[PDB]
From a paper:
GEFs catalyze the dissociation of GDP, allowing GTP to bind instead, and thus produce the active form of the GTPase.
Although the general mechanism for GEF‐binding and the exchange reaction differs between subfamilies, some overarching similarities can be identified. Binding of GTP converts the complex back into a low‐affinity state and eventually the GEF is released, generating the active form of the GTPase. The GEFs bind to the GTPase, induce conformational changes within the switch I loop, and stabilize the complex by interacting with the switch II region.5b The GEFs generate the nucleotide‐free complex either by inserting residues to hinder the GDP phosphate‐binding region and/or the Mg2+, or remodeling switch II to destabilize the guanine nucleotide.4, 5b Compared to the intrinsic rate of reaction, GEFs can increase the rate of exchange by several orders of magnitude. Interfacial inhibitors are defined as a drug that targets the interface between two or more different biomolecules that are found in a functional complex.
Author numbering:
A (entry chain B): 12 to 38, 45 to 128, 132 to 177
B (entry chain A): 398 to 659, 666 to 698, 704 to 743
Write the structure that this text describes.
Amino acid sequence: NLYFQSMRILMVGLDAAGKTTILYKLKTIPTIGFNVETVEYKNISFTVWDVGGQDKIRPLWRHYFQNTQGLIFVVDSNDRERVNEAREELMRMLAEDELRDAVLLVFANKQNAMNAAEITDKLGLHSLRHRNWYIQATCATSGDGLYEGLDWLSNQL
Amino acid sequence: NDVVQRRHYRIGLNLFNKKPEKGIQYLIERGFLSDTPVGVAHFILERKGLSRQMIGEFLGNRQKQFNRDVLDCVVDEMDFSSMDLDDALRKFQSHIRVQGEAQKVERLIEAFSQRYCVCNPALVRQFRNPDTIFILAFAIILLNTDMYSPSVKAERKMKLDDFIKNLRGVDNGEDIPRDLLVGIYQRIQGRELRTNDDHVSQVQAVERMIVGKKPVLSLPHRRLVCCCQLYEVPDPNRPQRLGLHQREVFLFNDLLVVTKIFVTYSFRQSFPLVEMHMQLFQNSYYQFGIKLLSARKVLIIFNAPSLQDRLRFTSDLRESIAEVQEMEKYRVESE
């Protein structure tokens, strides 16, 4: 890890999954608009965007897909009622051709919560053929697992 | 009785700044607030001491029908007639802190774009798809994040043409008139989107004066009450030099912060106000004494420069303690 590298990561996930909490533990008054903090890990500088929106809004993010090396998807392991729309949230993002080669890190947050195998199936992770992905059990409020997934993410980039 | 009611009022504000819907419930039961979404919209827009960040958290909720109706009421109070979209968005965000997750930002821009169209039906009709105003407003605040976020390095910031190219074909395959976007970009380039100040702004300013390691002070519910100069007394039974151990004390509604001059200050110690007790004393070596305890247990001893300084500080502290003990009583009645 000789050279300092700057990379862009996109954080995707439903509201209340824990995107803000995870981003808070890995970084003045935040700039008005969308969360975007810097994460420096092992001589890698990660600019991390919080991304989202409905269909007609999504194409505004394509400008930021071009220089995107990693995707971080946060799912609430406890909200089984919303896991299917979480899957749609993840899959709609993965349908963008500009994100074809980005690596996928899934934070299973809030570990009667679904386990890793349950979330891997309900989120359809194994349907991604040419995708390098990894699911990491984490507790956003206790910082557990955050840096293990960040270990995997950096090792892949 | 009159002081106890303004205290209960401030309790309502505190509760909102921690969980807004619990403060709304609190202020309604105690008889301070109307329970209709239009009354809450007026309260939110007008009353001071509300965290504009937490107002956004409350208004941005896309699952609760009450929060959504309140948000609709909030925008109905604003008039965007004959305003540039970015300008109207700036006026809208000046009230609510439009910052956070992409989903929260979307909900707020959503209600805002709906209000802007009602306020400009002619101009909106000039577009193949009125969804353009919403998509454009979203893109406006996105430009603000891109352009002014310190975490987006200069070289990678979106240039004017990257902005125009990011909006190509939005209007049912047509483009937004290019001369228009250039105006939006330049205005945002000349004035960053900025929220109106609230009470958290005064705590943030105290955080800046303190250099070095420190606790996180500017939490949404915390309000600055008093700044006072005192002398820490390690031994009230023995004298100390004139002006020794001079402190810069910061009294918040739920926290006592003790600093010294490092103007810049070095953080020394903070005390919660729960179980904190207070007693004034005056002996031969200390005429304006202040002793803080916990229940019993000495926390620290002060000697004010004058009795007015002790009278003013002690008064604020006595009320902040009583206010905090109200928070405890409620925060345990949480069944």
